[PDB]
Amino acid sequence: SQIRQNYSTEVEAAVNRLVNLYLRASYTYLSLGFYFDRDDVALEGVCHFFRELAEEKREGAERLLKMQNQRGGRALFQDLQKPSQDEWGTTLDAMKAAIVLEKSLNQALLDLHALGSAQADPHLCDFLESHFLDEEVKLIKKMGDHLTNIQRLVGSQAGLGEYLFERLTL
Amino acid sequence: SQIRQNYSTEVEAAVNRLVNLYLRASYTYLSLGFYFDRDDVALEGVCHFFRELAEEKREGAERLLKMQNQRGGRALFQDLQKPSQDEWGTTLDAMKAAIVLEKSLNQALLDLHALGSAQADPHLCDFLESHFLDEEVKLIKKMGDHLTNIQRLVGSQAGLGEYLFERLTL
Amino acid sequence: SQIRQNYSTEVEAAVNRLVNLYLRASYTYLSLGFYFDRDDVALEGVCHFFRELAEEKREGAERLLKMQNQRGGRALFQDLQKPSQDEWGTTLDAMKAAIVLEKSLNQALLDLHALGSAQADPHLCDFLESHFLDEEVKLIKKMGDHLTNIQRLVGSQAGLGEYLFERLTL
Amino acid sequence: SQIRQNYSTEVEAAVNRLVNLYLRASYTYLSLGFYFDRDDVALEGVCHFFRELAEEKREGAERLLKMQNQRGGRALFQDLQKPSQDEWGTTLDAMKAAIVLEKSLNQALLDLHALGSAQADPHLCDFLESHFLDEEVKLIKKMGDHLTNIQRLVGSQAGLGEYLFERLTL
């Protein structure tokens, strides 16, 4: 590559794997979204929340791919595994699965940051800082908040709690 | 008829019966609507939902009648039977009765489509496709959703659930 | 399902497979798009054309999933295979691969239409008619046109032809 | 200096040398710009591209000088060497010389970042991250793209290719 400079093969590979993880996450959110749109689940606000996250994760992958091209790396795509479940249980179960997912993306972002630091690649480090690490921290906080409110609600009267959360928070 | 072309007597008759079914449905919804406006039921949002459906069904009948005239068929009207109940129970009972009603209209629309197909009447088929079959599918989905939410709500505290559904969904 | 009516398991399954094919197509277009954004390929208009198609195919899948929920079917997601190539050659090679892809989606849409017809499912038939079959026909025509123009251009002076196509058509 | 804090003499010196390199680059671009404005070269779009880069590099130097004052360092200016050529050959030759130049600025920015990291100077590191490293990466990508397009064009018919690039890309 005429342009490639200070961009290790190790970072390039890790960026490709991070793209796969974000597309996998987007796919998980698409599945969570359409589950909550089932006539026998019918929580539109929960569906809308997850459809929006499917879009953000897809945009995450696209920014990574653009960055990969800008540094002179080569995008390589792999099979995208299907989501870990076909049915996602209650809003509580789903929001728990979403926090697990986001923390695993976050950890992957931190691992890549560590690698960039080890390879003295400040451009990589700054690009993760600017566009990924703060968004993940904010999102995980918002999910933790939602989780707390769902739990407080689904003490007695679980059905009533799920409905009220969907109507008044989402 | 100077204009009538490729329009069987079998289709004409079935269109007249479909008009009767839509007017009967409109009448059912008028009765459901005013039941929920009773001072001893007093669920305004439920009343408004059914009054709106009374209007859509009436419009359904009018489009069918207009189509019948456009093809050179002859509208024939019959007695309209009164609704199947005088009192409609809870929001849950009503929404169940409404889904039963809509599925019976839907089936009548499918039977007429089958007949149009058998008679090689693509105009009839397209007119049902365009104006009736998709609307019924969307409406039945919306009713199934409402039904799911009512059920989730009326676990314990049935009165509280019915109130919240009316206030926050309808 | 309280709502499901005239929706065979055979159609439900075929809809799920069609969703997989559209997501696979979207993924192919994402890969074609970022290939043309490589510093050593650098045909921005070609990149933009394929990124737009990635978005349309994703929207295709989402409309199918919404329809599946509306009929009372159950979305099931599978692994998404990676695109058939990692590097896509010239604009000519890419546009040929895109036409092959679209014709395979089109054929899948026709097969599903045939099945809907066999199962007397006019709602399915109309939904494919309205939202998929005409778009595919228009898109394939636009790709055939592009292909003809690329070929006319890359007689002698292949590099000059590819550049001019990107600048003046895309 | 009353204000100077955590700002090593090693960083101060390196900032002064980086200022010299950016002013030298600005001067190179001024020379490239006016070469392409010669009546016997007459590629206005190429002239405009390089004049714009002369301005960006000058602005780069000014931001560095402002930063040097903000940290309590002392700007020191040195002789600015004249550009490495008096005539710059074809658009292809010029864009190659420009990529070489930018990569040498980029490397200087990375070396300074490394030094800031070694000296535990996070303000320096963040200031380079924010205002210099991403701009260089984007610019080098844009130059690599331009280079690819020029090369594709100047296969046969070099004169025709240079003209078309200037008219339709720049």
Ligand SMILES: [Cl-]
């Ligand atoms: Cl290097």
Ligand SMILES: [Cl-]
């Ligand atoms: Cl006739």
Ligand SMILES: [Cl-]
């Ligand atoms: Cl059935």
Ligand SMILES: [Cl-]
């Ligand atoms: Cl100090």
Ligand SMILES: [Fe+3]
């Ligand atoms: Fe959105």
Ligand SMILES: [Fe+3]
């Ligand atoms: Fe966003």
Ligand SMILES: [Fe+3]
């Ligand atoms: Fe968004």
Ligand SMILES: [Fe+3]
């Ligand atoms: Fe967005």
Ligand SMILES: [Fe+3]
């Ligand atoms: Fe940093």
Ligand SMILES: [Fe+3]
């Ligand atoms: Fe930083």
Ligand SMILES: [Fe+3]
């Ligand atoms: Fe109205």
Ligand SMILES: [Fe+3]
């Ligand atoms: Fe209407």
Ligand SMILES: [Fe+3]
């Ligand atoms: Fe209306």
Ligand SMILES: [Fe+3]
């Ligand atoms: Fe109206």
Ligand SMILES: [Fe+3]
């Ligand atoms: Fe038809």
Ligand SMILES: [Fe+3]
């Ligand atoms: Fe778009």
